[PDB]
């Protein structure tokens, strides 16, 4: 068995490494208001 252990590990871990890719990007969600 243990099919989920290694696969699932790489799963939540697959996005964990992917989260860094989103970091360091310009975000305009703040829009106006935040400028103050």
């Amino acid at each position: 068995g243990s099919r989920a252990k290694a696969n699932w590990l790489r799963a939540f871990n697959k996005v964990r490494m992917q989260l860094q890719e989103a970091r360091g990007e310009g975000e305009m969600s703040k829009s106006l208001w935040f400028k103050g």
């Binding site: 068995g1 099919r3 989920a4 290694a6 696969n7 699932w8 790489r10 799963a11 939540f12 871990n13 697959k14 996005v15 964990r16 992917q18 989260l19 860094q20 989103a22 970091r23 305009m28 969600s29 703040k30 829009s31 106006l32 208001w33 935040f34």
Partner: protein, 148 residues
């Protein structure tokens, strides 16, 4: 933990009481409509709900005191995680929500090697499924990689 200065927050509280007319402890785009309109800016209702739901954490379409203050503090390094786990959920299910299903998880499996079926996903969800719903919520994911 990277807390603002009492003077910075206190000043916002006074501006909140004067700026906020709804009488609630949160900020609503309607109030933005009236202020931006007063300064010569009258955006459409669509931009109002958009600009407001994106500036507040969670995106309920309104910016609470902590949500707006946290966004202002975001400029300075707050935590290493920086809510990066949210991005993991956003990729697990393009859908635009924070819940991972057996199929979506299989999608992340696709990112690595191993090919899985409904059995392998139900098992992987069985481990994180503390709620017993056959699906993995946000706290369950962090229970796996974070295990706090």
């Amino acid at each position: 933990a990277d807390q603002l200065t009492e003077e910075q927050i206190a000043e916002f509280k006074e501006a909140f009481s004067l700026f906020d007319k709804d009488g609630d402890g949160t900020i609503t785009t309607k109030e933005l409509g009236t202020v931006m309109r007063s300064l010569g800016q009258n955006p459409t209702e669509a931009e109002l709900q958009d600009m407001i739901n994106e500036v507040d954490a969670d995106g309920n379409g309104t910016i609470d005191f902590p949500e707006f203050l946290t966004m202002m503090a975001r400029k300075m390094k707050d935590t290493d995680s920086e809510e990066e786990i949210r991005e993991a959920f956003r990729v697990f299910d393009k859908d635009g929500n924070g819940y991972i299903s057996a199929a979506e998880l299989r999608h992340v499996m696709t990112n690595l090697g191993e090919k899985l079926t409904d059995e392998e996903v139900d098992e992987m969800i069985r481990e994180a499924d503390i709620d017993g719903d056959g699906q993995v919520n946000y706290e369950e994911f962090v229970q796996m990689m974070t295990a706090k």
